[PDB]
């Protein structure tokens, strides 16, 4: 996260780390949506242009964390994957449309003060809250400064970072880029004029864009960190997978097994 701040403890108990186990590295963020299911971006697992194709045994999920690099000994839980599910129409050839994947955990995590699932939006929550100008919140352990152009100024955080960003109008989104934007995406970020900055950045992909409902005070995940051009570049915006538009597939796959 670029221009964010350190998260408080327990501020985002659904945040998950996607961790590969050899070499040990952070791949991406993710989110806990029940005791056995994790949501992330499909491009974290599967991206043929770069010969990226992770399977279950390649990966660990780490839940309950705050420190990026510490093994957080009586706090985090580490889990193994039993099944990865990518959207059958994820478009990695062109524009990362339907950039979504579900992961089944080998066995359920227990909740705690540090581990708690986020809600998924329904129609009226989506309708009400997904409006330009409304702010949501993005969290992650990715770079603090632009890294598809690998950067200094500090580099990597020690703790989970947070930033709050406005949703932007679709015309301005589509006018900022040459990429074809779909209805399964939205964009977010401040405009060049507004004074404030901030963005997700490398290593943040796959993580939650969340909003808090003013009607029932619950946190809902509205987006997944999906893509962008650079990090925090003026006149560019982050793009997020639209979680409500792909909710039938999510329900479908967690109903089919589903046991």
């Amino acid at each position: 996260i670029v221009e964010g701040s350190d998260a408080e403890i327990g501020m985002s108990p659904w945040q998950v780390m996607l961790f590969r186990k050899s070499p040990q590295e952070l791949l991406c963020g993710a989110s806990l949506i029940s005791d056995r299911w994790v949501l992330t971006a499909a491009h974290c697992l599967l991206y043929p242009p770069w010969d990226k194709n992770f399977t279950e045994n390649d990966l660990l999920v780490r839940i309950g964390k705050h420190s990026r690099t510490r093994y957080e000994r009586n706090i985090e839980k580490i889990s193994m994957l039993e099944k990865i599910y990518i959207h059958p129409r994820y478009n990695w050839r062109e524009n990362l449309d339907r950039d979504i994947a579900l992961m089944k955990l080998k066995k359920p995590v227990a909740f705690s003060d540090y581990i708690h699932p986020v809600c998924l939006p329904d129609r009226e929550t989506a309708a009400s809250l997904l409006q330009a100008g409304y702010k949501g919140r993005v969290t992650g352990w990715g770079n603090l400064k632009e890294t598809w152009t690998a950067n200094v100024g500090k580099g990597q955080p020690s703790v989970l970072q947070v930033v709050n960003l406005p949703i932007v109008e679709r015309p301005v989104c589509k006018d900022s880029t040459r990429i074809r934007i779909t209805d399964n995406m939205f964009c977010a970020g401040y405009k060049p004029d507004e004074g404030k900055r901030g963005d997700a950045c490398e290593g943040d992909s796959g993580g939650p864009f969340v909003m808090k409902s003013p009607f029932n005070n619950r946190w809902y995940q509205m987006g997944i960190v999906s893509w962008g051009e650079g990090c925090d570049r003026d006149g560019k915006y982050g793009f997020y997978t639209h979680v409500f538009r792909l909710k039938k597939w999510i329900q479908k796959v967690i109903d089919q097994f589903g046991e």
Binding site: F19, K21, S22, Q24, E25, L26, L60, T69, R70, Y71, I78, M80
Partner: peptide, 10 residues
């Protein structure tokens, strides 16, 4: 860069 995790996780 990461601290060592327990070998029951690999």
């Amino acid at each position: 860069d990461f601290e060592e995790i327990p070998e029951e996780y690999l």
